[PDB]
Each structure stands twice: as structure tokens, then as C-alpha cells.
Symmetry: C5
Subunit: 266 residues, 5 copies
Amino acid sequence: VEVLEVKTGVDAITEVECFLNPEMGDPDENLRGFSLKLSAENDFSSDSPERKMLPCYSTARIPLPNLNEDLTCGNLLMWEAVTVQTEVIGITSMLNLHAGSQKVHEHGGGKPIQGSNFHFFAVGGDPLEMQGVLMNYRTKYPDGTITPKNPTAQSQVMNTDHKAYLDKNNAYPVECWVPDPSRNENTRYFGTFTGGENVPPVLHVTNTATTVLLDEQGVGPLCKADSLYVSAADICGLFTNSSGTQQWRGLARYFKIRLRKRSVKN
Amino acid sequence: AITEVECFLNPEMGDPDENLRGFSLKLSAENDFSSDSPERKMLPCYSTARIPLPNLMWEAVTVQTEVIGITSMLNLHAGSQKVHEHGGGKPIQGSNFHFFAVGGDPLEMQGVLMNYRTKYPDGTITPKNPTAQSQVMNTDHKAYLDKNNAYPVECWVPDPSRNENTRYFGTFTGGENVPPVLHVTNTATTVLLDEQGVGPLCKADSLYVSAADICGLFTNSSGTQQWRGLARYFKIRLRKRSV
Amino acid sequence: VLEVKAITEVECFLNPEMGDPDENLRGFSLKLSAENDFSSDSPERKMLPCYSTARIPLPNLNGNLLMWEAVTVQTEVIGITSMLNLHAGSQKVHEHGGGKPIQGSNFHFFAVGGDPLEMQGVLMNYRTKYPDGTITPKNPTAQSQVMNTDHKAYLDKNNAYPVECWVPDPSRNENTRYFGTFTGGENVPPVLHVTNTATTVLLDEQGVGPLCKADSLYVSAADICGLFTNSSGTQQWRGLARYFKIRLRKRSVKN
Amino acid sequence: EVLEVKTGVDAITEVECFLNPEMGDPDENLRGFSLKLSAENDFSSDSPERKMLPCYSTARIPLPNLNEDLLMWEAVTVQTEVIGITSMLNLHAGSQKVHEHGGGKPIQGSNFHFFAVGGDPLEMQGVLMNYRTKYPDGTITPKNPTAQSQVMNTDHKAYLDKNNAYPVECWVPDPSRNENTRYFGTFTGGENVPPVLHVTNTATTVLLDEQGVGPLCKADSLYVSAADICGLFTNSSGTQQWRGLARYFKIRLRKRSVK
Amino acid sequence: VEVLEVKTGVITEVECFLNPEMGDPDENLRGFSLKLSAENDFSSDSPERKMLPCYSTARIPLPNLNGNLLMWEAVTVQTEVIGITSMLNLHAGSQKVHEHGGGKPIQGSNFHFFAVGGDPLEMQGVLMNYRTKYPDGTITPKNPTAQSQVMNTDHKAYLDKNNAYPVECWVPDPSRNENTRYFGTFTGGENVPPVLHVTNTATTVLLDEQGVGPLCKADSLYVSAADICGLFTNSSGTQQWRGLARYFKIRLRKRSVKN
Ligand SMILES: [Cl-]
Ligand SMILES: [Cl-]
Ligand SMILES: [Cl-]
Ligand SMILES: [Cl-]
Ligand SMILES: [Cl-]
């Protein structure tokens, strides 16, 4: 994390940068960035996934410099997030087809990472707000995860009881939660899910691409209590081991966020 | 002057028992066209809701919408057939349909059938007195989407010759191995204004939302297959217009 | 072509013409044969999808004259959700599985003009012996497998011009606008969109749309959605109807 | 040096043509196809037959004669599409059944669609899969290639100056040249690649560069070039042949003043 | 440097064809990698040097232009992959798709990347397997840990040597590269079709949001690339990366700066 006062004064611009690590499970000390091997074919009535098999959302709160020296003034200053540049880091590491992966056929190279993937990021001045949805409401989730409380069959579609803040890194399983479009007035989020056994990962990098965070009235997220929130999930696909077992692979996400000072009423 | 309303519309995939809400009954295959009698719980239907408004007319101006719970398909540990020996479960994939409508009147639909001789089960509303022409265009088959969980998706499409007071959007992608591709963002808005700058006008102080979101097929360990659907969120901005 | 002068709307649903092998299978073709030698390729009539077309008469408005000018079209394929019936007739994807979706080669095409669509003949196999009731390239040669300029036709009859023999002619059609997409392959997914919010403008670079020459408006289409695979393994083309809503205006022209 | 566009009577013209594909044409009945594909030749003994090799198509269109000593014809737009795309809906003839009782296999697999419009012949750069390929009489291929010819060897410069002679697998348009040509190509490779081809008489490609100047036709000649390999046709035996289709061009030109 | 106005008056272009560095296992297999190994345990993963594609780079020298000084500024780049049609050779080396069929197209995982800057490309290391033992002649992350499989900020490198930095080890660094523009797309998968476009009508603008392009502060311009097109499958079943050269044409102008 770096917080840089690029310019000071009324038109002050501060740039925050950070690399958010993925939280795929990390089943042992040497497989950081991967999940535990996937189980299959568990009956809905006895589906008890292991902690390290479940990728979770990544998140961090980044403290910003205090702007208000007199807290009793009629007008106070807040940091306002105006743009974000972001990309997934280490995509070329998937070109290692010599280590660990099942050969595609006899005498062939290793099988590329492929299959279902999810790429998501958010930037806001409050924690990202999430809605819970489950494949199977009777899944017994493991200690260390935070998942929908008292789920019912309705939790497999929409159960409005399942509201949460993404307020803990490596705790909210990606399979249980989505960003909540009925809330998040102070966050911009973006995600794409692509499902399937053989789905090719497609990932772009460039330092020339910027996303604008301003709403239709020209206001970006406002950093409450001088806190900027970054969230991500970048499940790149499934790594298939020589044995045939499969593990999720994730990669870190870079953020560069440009902020300006907005005057608001107390 | 301006008001916003929102709704989470649940999918109606069939719901074969109390536990399998959001899924259909397992799919039958290979019925002859002359003896095709599908069970009610096997047929996804269109979802719809009528949203009352404060009582000039309310004009629908924009809609924000997205499919809810897409990441739930990352549960590959529960119920699904292994992709190979020692491998994880098979992702939901295959034919899918994503559709929504916003209107001041119920959605107007036209009936088209794969097989006109299909015997549809009690509880569904399907084209009446179908003929072979019902497999192409039979203009007799007009309906209003006036009941939730009743009009099967396979029997009905939005009618482009009507719907003067509704805007609708859908995409059908067919095939066994088709990957679901779903995007979420709170930064996308669809403007509902026509070329004259006029949106859907809510006739009896009612706003109509409609959806179908069949995400693909879930393959059980045994090889059987079931539709999986997801709820759809709507946030509609309305303004008052005099008439 | 002088000033614009007033406004009328026509709409039509054009049925597909996939072959219709019996009275129950409207919208399908006869099952496909395979592996006919080029020297003995005699397709049956009901196996061959043809272009759909209709002529829509308009009011007769007549030194100068007035003509109906086509300005915009809204069009879409009708019944796309019918392909979610995987219980009827289709081969199971595997044991205990649902039926196989319609998929594979598809062609989606429409045209709007004030003359019949002008077409160019091109054939896979020039030696194909086409059946009675079809209108195909006359006196074809090896060159008819590439470009043979002899093969000019008007789409002047419904359910007669096989889709496999004919394409819209880009060297002609001055008074028609046409649009088509061919996607080929064994397992290609059908992808079809619907919305009543999309309009195709028919005006050319000078703001002039198709002009209905003898008070007739022409619509044409082909919407082969893919192949339907029966339990036996036999395959049939499946097609769907196309809707047209065309807005016209009155235009002054010199005689 | 380019001056003002010239307007007036006869300052505009339009030309059109159809360019036939050059896929090999293995016998008198198989126009538009290649000879069946061989496979698995060692790089040291790779001798493709003439009729197995698709070649670029090209033609020169004469324009109304302007005095070369000052005006030149300037190509402004081109309308172009592939002709006969629906012919691939013939699945009854020649093609291997997809399975027992099934229809024939569609044409699919690797494909290349390319066109160019210019006031000079298209300038090409040679690149080879295998520098040791022994090309047959009747083809013009990179001369005296080396191992470097499998990547970039700048000796391999050629003009597309002969129809049905330059194999598509040996040559690409040269981005370091072609100051007076606009070219456009897409290669898609793979066994099962679906052909995707659009037609419409409403789409135009503008040939003007960033200064608003199109190709200038040197001696009242317009050069058109194309390659449209649509995929592989699979015979019932399992053998495979390239299938190609003709391309139509309609080019609009204007007179431009020069010095 | 404080950037002042563009120096106007009676702009230059430089160009380069940058060769791919796929490993080149012998004198005849320029542009390919060594055959790919598979299934090496993470604890004993020792790739041979000729199996590892590396980033390509070149330095283009420029003449010095000199209170206010002048520097060359890169405004636009035209770039494309060279030799894409070479993949239509399905007769040489590749395994037949089925009995009596043609050869298997190049397909599978591919990466296409370029950069243009006034300093060498700045890179960040990320590994599939931190315990990989890389071969002599490669430059790879130093003292990697488990954290090196996600983000380890210690792994910073300059692309300061051609055919040395393995593609699999390094990515352009978005936290640096203030004076370079880079662009890349990774497409992974066993059977991914290559899709490659060529046209001389496409230009990438290298100006930033203030209208300033990369500045050649030490009178040098840097081009960098990786173009792994896919995997070639030999008749034996073995697989090799295939790469192709990348063309660059960069338009430069003179920019005044404060000393
Ligand atoms: Cl909860
Ligand atoms: Cl009815
Ligand atoms: Cl004829
Ligand atoms: Cl040469
Ligand atoms: Cl390092």
C-alpha cells in the first residue's frame, strides 16, 4: 500500500495504490494462491465443504489523511474517489505447463488452467454491501467462514435476511455472496462470472485504461471516516493436477485510485 | 416529482420439492412428439409482479437490473456430477435465457411451440387449440403475462407487434456446453424513453416487471439434469407526467 | 427524387419455409441425408429450406409523382424460447440426461425493398440435381461453385428458392437493404436477441430509403436456427417466423 | 504532395468486381476447393502439391485515363463481402456424416479472410511455418529461405503481382510498406472453428487516412486483393479440403489534385 | 522533467521488426520452443532453457536534439503480429486430426503483448510454483517464497536483456511504467483458437491524459513484446510453443522540457 500526496491545496489529488492478494484457501504453506482440491458429488443433505476449499472475497480498508482540523465548521472536507485503474497481476504464470498439471494427452504438455471463473472489484467509501445466495441452503459451512445465517429453501433464490458488509478479509466465501444492487450508494462494483468446464480465461492488462467512479451527478464515492475500501475476487479457473484433482487458482489485483477533496455540509 | 421503486423478482423454475427452490424437476428426454406430456414442475415459467404506485401519471424513465446470486454456481462440491475421476463437480452450463421487461401494462406475449402436440399440465397457461402453424406463427396465440408461475418460458415470447407501453429485452443462447456469462455492476442504467422521449406510462397507477433467467442445466451425479434459475433485481426511476 | 412530403406503418409476420416434411412438422425440414457423391446428389424437396418472401401492396398515390419511401424497420425472430423444450423428440445428451438442444449451422437474414430481392447463385456442388418445385441456378458449371454471373434471380416466389443456392446480390439491390449472418459448424450455439427498442434505419447516404416503385413493398427472410437431433440420431433444420414493422413516408419524384 | 479534392462533372467514379477464390482447384469439377490435405510430413520432407495450396487472388482495375503529365483518382470507400456463404448449408453432398443417421459435417476449422484496396500492388512479407518446405512449380514463395524465415527475414519482400501464385501460407501483407494501400485481415485457427460471415449492402469501409487521403491510383490503376479460406470440408473418407469463396468489391473514387 | 510545449516546424518515424524468443531448440526450429514436459512435481520442477519463451526487447537509438532542452516524444504506434497465415500450413509436422485428415492447427494458450516507452519496461514477478528451479541464462525472481505465487513486491525487474526474462515469470508492472505504455491479452486453455487481426489502418495513441507521450529521456526508445501464438502438436504427440515476430512503427515528435 502507498498513499501519495501528488498535489496539495484546494485541487489536491492523492493517489492510493495497493495490491490485494487473493484468498483462494491456501491449503498448505507452499500452495499460496490455490484452494484445497475440490470434492464432488456430495448430497445436498450432507454437503460440508472444508475451509481451505472455499475461495473468499478479498478486502482492505485504507486509511486516508485527515482533512478537517476544526470539526465544528459548517463545511467539512472528504476524500472523493474519482478514478480507478486496476488489473489482475501474474496472468502469464499460467504459461507454466511443466509443473504439477495433468498432461493433455500422452507426451503432451500440462493442461492449462481453465473452467469457471469470476473477476470482480469494488471501490467505495463504505464497506461493500453484499446479498447472500446459496446453491444449496443446507450446506454446512466451516468454522472461519461467514455465510448466510438461518438459511431456508428461499435462500437458494432471494432471501432478504442475508445482508452483510464485506468487513473481514478471507471470510466471506465467494459462492455464498454477491454485491447487493439494492444498496451500495457509496460504492461502485463491477463483476463478470463465466461458468463451464472448459471456459478459457481471457485477461487483459494495460496501464492506459481508467474507470471513472463518478455517478450521474458527477460525485464519486465519499470516504467516510477517511476510509477507502477496496474489494476483489479473481478466481481464474481450475488447475488440474496430475492425479486429476482440481484446485481453484487466484491472482492478486492491483488498484490505483485517484482522490480529490470534496467540501460537504457538516 | 421523481420516485424510485425496487423489487427482487424470484425465478419460477418449477421447484420440485420444498428443498429444491430455484431448480426444475429433472428433465425427461426422447418423448415422441405424439406423446409429450411434461410435468408441471419440469417447466420454468415467466416471473412477473405488479408494483402499486402513489396516486398526472407515473412515467418509467430508467431501469437498473441484474441477476442475483451468480457466484452460487462456484459451489462445485454439492450434488453435481464429477467432470472426471478425482475431479470437482460439473458447472451449470447449457441452454439459457435472460429476459426482463418494464411496463405500464402487463407484458403482451405471442405463443410459439416446438411441438404443437405437446400436452401441457394443469396449472400452466399455454396456447389454446394449437395447430401445426403454432410451430411457426399462429396469430391466435396472444396472452398477457397476468399470472406469476403459470406461463411456461418454452411456450411464449414477448410480442413485438404489441407492447406499445412496455420495453423488453432478452437473449437466448442454446447448446449443451454453452458457458453462462453474467455481469454485475451498479453503474449500468437502461433508459426506457422512446424516440419521442416518452417512457412507459403507468395506466392504473401500476408498474409491471417481468423476467426469465434460466442460467443453464445442473447435472446430478446420476446424470440427470435440472434447470437452475436466479432472482432478478429491478430499480426503476419514475417521474410524474400530465396527460 | 425530390422532396419528402403522409406517414404509414405496415407490419407482417413472415413464416419460415424449412421444407415441412409432413403436416405435423411445419417449421422443420425433412431429415438430412449425408455423404451423397457430388456426381449423384439429388436432394428431396422437403429437405431444402427456402427463402421466405411477401409483397405488401400499398395505396396508389398517382410531371411529378408520389411514392412510398421505406424509412425504418423493426424486425425480430419469433419463438426463440421454444428451443427450451428438451423433452420432445430430441436425443438424450447422455444416459438419464435431458434432450439435446437445437444447435449447429444457422443463417439469419432479412431484407426490405421497393423491388424484389435480387440474388446471386452459388453452389457447393454444381452437379447437384435439385427437385421439382425449386428454382435453382440454370445451366450451372464448375464456376458456379465460385462466382458465375449467369446466376441472377429475383426472389419472386415464396418457398421456391433454396437457401443453399442463393445469396443476396451486392452488385445489385439498389432499392433494397439487406442484412444477413451465417454461422457454420457442428455444435455452434444459437444466439438470438429480442427487444422492441431496436430500429434499423433504411435511408442511404442521401437520406433516401427504398422507394416502392409500383406501390409494392417487399419483405424477405431466412431464419434457419440450427439442427434438431432426433432420438434415432437423424437431424432436421428448424426455422422460425420473422416479424417486420416498417414505417413509410410519401416522397416526391420526377417522372 | 497532396492538394485539394477536385469536384465538378465526372469528378466521381465507382468500380466493382468479383474476385474468384484460388484454393487449388484439384480437378475440373472441384473449383473453389483445394486438393485433399496431407498431414505429418517431417519438416525435412515437406513437399506440398500445387493444387493443395490456396493462393491470394488479385486483379488490376483500369480507371478513366487522367493526364500523368495534375489529377489522380483517390479511393475513398469500399463495400465488400464474401459471396455464396449459404452454399455451406448443403450438408447432403460429399461430407462425412456427423454420426450414424446424421447429416453431413459442416465446413469448419481454420479460416482466413482478407482484402486490400490500393493504387499500387499489395506489398507482402514472407513468413514460413517450415523454412525447408519444398514448394511446387507454379508458386512464388520466399526465395532461398533460412531458419530466420520462420520468424522475420527482411529479404522476403514481394508484390502481389500475379493471381493464383502466391500461397496464403507463405505471405502476409507488409505493415512496413503499403503507404498507398489499405488492407484488412483476420486469421482464426482451430479444428472446430465456426465460420462467421456477415453480408449487407449498407456497410462501407472508409479508405481515408488520418489526413483525409485515400489510396492514390498511380497510373489510373486500382488494385484489389483477397483471400477467403472459409474452413475445411470433410469428405466421408475423412479427408479434408480447403473451401473458399469469391469476394465482391465496390470502390468509390474521386479526383484529387496533386503536385 | 517538467514538460513544456511541443516544438513545431519542419516529426520522424522509427520502425522495428522484433523477433520472438520462444527458446529455439535447434538451428531449424527458430520460432518454436523445445517440446513441453508435463507433470513435474512442484518440488522437482527444473525447466530446460530452450523450453521457456522469453520477452523480446530492443533499444532504438536516437540523436540528441540539443534553459529549455528538447527530447523525442513517442506519439503513436502501429503494430501487428507478422506471419499469421503461416499457421495455414497443416501439411508439415503436425499430428493428423483423425485418420486421413489434415494436420492439427496451432491452438491453445496464447499471450500477445507489446510496450513502447522511453525507459526499459518495468516488470513484476509472479510464479505458478515458487520452487521452480530455473535454468542458467534466464533471469527470474530472486529468493522467491510462497508469497511469490501471489504478490511479492520484492520481485521488481527491468526488461534490460533480450531472450532472458521468461514470459511465465514476469508481467508488466502497473505500479511503475510511468514512461511506458503497455498492452497485453492472455487467453488460456487447451483448445483455444488463435484469433489474429492485421491492418495498416489501426494506430494506438501513446499520449496520456495530459497529452504527453513517452519521453526518450536518454535519447533511446524501447520496444518490448511477447507473442506466443499457441501450441504446435507434433505427430508424436509432443507440443511446442510457436511464436511470431512483431512489427512496430512509432511516430515521434520533438518536445521541449525544462533542464
Ligand atoms: Cl445472513
Ligand atoms: Cl392462445
Ligand atoms: Cl440462373
Ligand atoms: Cl523472397
Ligand atoms: Cl526479483
